Amino acid sequence: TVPDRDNDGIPDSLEVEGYTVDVKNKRTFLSPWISNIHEKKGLTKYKSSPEKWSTASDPYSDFEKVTGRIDKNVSPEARHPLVAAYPIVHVDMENIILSKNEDSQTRTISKNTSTSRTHTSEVHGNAAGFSNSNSSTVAIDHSLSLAGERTWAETMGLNTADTARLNANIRYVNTGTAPIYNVLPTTSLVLGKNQTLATIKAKENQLSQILAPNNYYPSKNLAPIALNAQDDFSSTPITMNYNQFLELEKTKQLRLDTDQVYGNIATYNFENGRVRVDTGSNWSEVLPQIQETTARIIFNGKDLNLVERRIAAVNPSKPLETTKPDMTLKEALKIAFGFNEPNGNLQYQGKDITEFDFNFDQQTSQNIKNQLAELNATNIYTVLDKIKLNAKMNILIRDKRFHYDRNNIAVGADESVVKEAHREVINSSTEGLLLNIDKDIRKILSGYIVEIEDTEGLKEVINDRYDMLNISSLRQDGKTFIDFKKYNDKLPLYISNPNYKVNVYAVTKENTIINPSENGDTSTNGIKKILIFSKKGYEIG
Amino acid sequence: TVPDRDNDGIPDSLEVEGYTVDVKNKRTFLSPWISNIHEKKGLTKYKSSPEKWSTASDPYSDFEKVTGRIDGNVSPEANHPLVAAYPIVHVDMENIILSKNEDSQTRTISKNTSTSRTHTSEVHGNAAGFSNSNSSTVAIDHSLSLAGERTWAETMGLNTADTARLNANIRYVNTGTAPIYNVLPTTSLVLGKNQTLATIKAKENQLSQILAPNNYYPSKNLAPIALNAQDDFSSTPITMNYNQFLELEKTKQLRLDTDQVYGNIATYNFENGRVRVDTGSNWSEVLPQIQETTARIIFNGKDLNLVERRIAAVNPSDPLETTKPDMTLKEALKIAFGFNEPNGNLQYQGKDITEFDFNFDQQTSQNIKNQLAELNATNIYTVLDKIKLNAKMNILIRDKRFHYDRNNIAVGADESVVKEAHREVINSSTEGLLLNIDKDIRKILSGYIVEIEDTEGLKEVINDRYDMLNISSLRQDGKTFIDFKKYNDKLPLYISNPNYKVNVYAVTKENTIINPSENGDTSTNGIKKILIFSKKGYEIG
Ligand SMILES: [Ca+2]
Ligand SMILES: [Ca+2]
Ligand SMILES: [Ca+2]
Ligand SMILES: [Ca+2]
């Protein structure tokens, strides 16, 4: 006869005042939080809403989340009652291949790509800020693989009356916290600004495979999915005219907008413990309610990729959402991403919180500036355990070192960081070098520039082209390999004197050029470089 | 037990004499209005009718509305029992392209448009005004984009025996208070008076996406819907013969009549709280009942766009509609739109109520003139808390400063406020002008006319063309930019004497012309202008 308004299984007083789940001899017990006998064993103090069946409005209950009777692919950070469990799938593009529409063996362009999940922010000054849909922008390689390939349009033989067809290899990736079971979304390939070339639509129930969190659908040891290469019934290619081809060759960038139609939800069944796809549940019934009653936080501290989580905060207008527990910013960071306090300081695996850069949108900036004024403080890193969150807040934590473009991708840091990151030299040789460059710093480097300094000092650039900076490689053990052999007619570096200096430069992605310049510049004159490597000729060998 | 006739969950005496929903320890509590302890916390005193399950006849209950057990996309002012929740969706047209029906790279004409929701009233005196329909008019840009493009019919190269095709990019927009979930409406494109060119019937349930209030269906970071472009199952073009092309070039105006077929309603499910689209409920059942038992009020204070809200008022001939609470005009403005009285004066974000203009239909003007007669007063702005509202009224609150056309769109103000709007100069030069013009004032300006004055005084107009007035540009920092270089062959203002005077004119949207006059008049001779700018040539540098 205890009260239970929401029918999840936990009585109301437990959900308000704190509860925990403990395993005795082998059985599980759900008991209230008694501080002296529970903190010792290392248990977690849960708090929930006594009037919602799921506090984060996702399809898994509070009981099912804390007690483990859940579909086991739900990510471990989403087993808290206040972290939402929902999938976020986008499309990753491996490589494209461009042919002319009908001896065509050396008349195709086959390039590698690079796809990243984007979070487009406010434009600076001459064009709720952060919007909720899955989109990724690819970046086609501008370097050369064939020794004498040039001039894409004349490489193929494209004229103004001709059309060009496109083909590519894609694979999906779920970076959220819940699995997708049968249906895959319908992404669309936008070129330029609004010019949709095609809508990539997978066949319905052509799979029965699960798409678990942090996993790819054609797995990394299988073959990718090719756009419209199957032909047969779908012999409809992806056609571009001449103007669109010129726009693609100028910009060298596409965009893949993915929608949010997923399948059904697989639910635990209390009789025999079987997880089975429920045709009564659906993700489209849940995703708006997740998006309206939770606070979004985006973070890239594990690697330079954006990771989105949502945390169930209050909304002071509705009385049903004033029932959820109070959520400070510190606790949200601790339960959602994995920060900790080893000695008092909130850090993320060594990196302190003061090395990250808080960026809100408009409404959140107003909302937090009011709290900072009423708390009488100016440093947000001091009062991080008093900033209350509310619903529809958008926060964006990012690393302070690098510089980010309009889509919040790291495109190149300060020069002092790049110089510091190249201080570990393992092997020096006439053919190449070996360094221990960090994984984070090596994301933002577009390429390298090699030139020879005389004893007096001169400048002769071996790879003196915009599309010849691709020399660097990486052995899997953890050691990169720069290569002078690649653009020196497969002959080693011409050490004319042992008292010379071999100057190597680095260029970040915000400074590189991907096209020929205005008049004729296929040279590295107008490219900003950073001094990286300058040693004598007799310390090389 | 307590009496509860309507069977929603609130007892009768509470609904008649006032109630509110308080949150104690963490649980919610529906209580009568205790004036001592509910006024301090800032709660709202609700009132409803004890015999209607939904007082504003919309498909959400009174209980569901006050307690927060509602769809979270329902607009926040429609959380009151006395404000109806229903969608008002129309079509926004972005840009059109016109070409001849079949080398067509310069045989086309591409223009940007401007779409606004209309509220067509009666003609002045020489032909009850307000009716229930969603329609918007577009305004194709009459000015030029290239250097010397002219003469639309000769630009496309048409004769009397030619037909032209039409293609455009549209976007739906929901400005009501409730969302649509699967179905999109079926608009029709009307040229002139009744010449329907085509009916847009974008296929239902090829989407599953939501059209939330104050949001667009292909969202602003996606690509728009193209009219009849892809041809997948659309083998018919949008044809237009020569006569209709002549009227289109004469008018440069269309019309988009959108009907009211929407999908189903998503309702709260009390066992697990899942908001799920119910196949039983439907908006077609609800919308006439909303339209017969409420009193609409149209307002354009936030910007110069019309916003329609409906407030549940009594109807004295009906015994079930004498159950609803008494609604005054002040309370309707306070709960529907967001007016407040800080000191005792009803004002909408600083602007006092006396800055707005009241307009009724015939029946409402009779009904309100009788109330002013029996109240013994002549000023409606003084007795605004004693004007009772009844059902089927129609009020139109609009801004006093402007002048409105047939569709109640702001098309011009008086001269004095236009001169006052341009007295903030950020930077002045011979290249352009930097100003802070207010965003509402700059919505009624069609373009500018620039000219140079002699030291004795002469009249030399630089851009002396009707299609060469678009010399204003707006940057995202919030500051406009006039530009002399646009029609001076990319060359700055040729000042001949530093003691000259520069004169810039402004032409509003009611005074501009879209077609040259009867003989050949591409001149700006008979165009009513306004003195904006008069400095010297030695002060702009
Ligand atoms: Ca409970
Ligand atoms: Ca609960
Ligand atoms: Ca009742
Ligand atoms: Ca009622």
Curated annotation (Swiss-Prot), chains A, B:
The record marks D489 as: Essential for binding to cell receptor. Residues 103-118 have a biased composition (Polar residues). Changing Q289A: Loss of heptamerization capability. Changing I495A: Decrease in toxicity due to decrease in cell binding. Changing W53A: No effect on LF-binding ability and as toxic as the wild-type. Changing I380A: Loss of toxicity due to defective oligomerization. It is found in: Host cell membrane; Host endosome membrane. Residues 402-541 are annotated as: Domain 4, binding to the receptor. It is a multi-pass membrane protein. Changing F63S: Impaired translocation of LF. The record marks F233 as: Phi-clamp. Residues 294-401 are annotated as: Domain 3, heptamerization. Changing K486A: Slight decrease in toxicity. Changing P11A: Decrease in the ability to bind to LF and partially toxic at high concentrations. Changing F358A: Loss of toxicity due to defective oligomerization. Phe-233 residue forms the phi-clamp in the pore and catalyzes protein translocation via a charge-state-dependent Brownian ratchet. To pass through this hydrophobic restriction, substrate proteins LF and EF need to be unfolded prior to translocation. The alpha-clamp consists in an amphipathic cleft between two adjacent PA protomers, which assists the unfolding of substrate proteins LF and EF. The alpha-clamp binds non-specifically to alpha-helices of substrate proteins LF and EF. Mature form that oligomerizes and forms a pore to translocate the enzymatic toxin components edema factor (EF) and lethal factor (LF) into the host cytosol. Following attachment to host cell receptors and cleavage by FURIN, homooligomerizes to form ring-shaped oligomers that are in a pre-pore conformation, and associates with EF and LF. Toxin-leaded complexes are then endocytosed in a clathrin-dependent process, followed by a conformational change of oligomerized PA-63 from the pre-pore to pore state, which is triggered by the low pH in the endosome. This is Protective antigen PA-63. It comes from Bacillus anthracis. The chain holds residues 203 to 764 of 764 of the full protein.
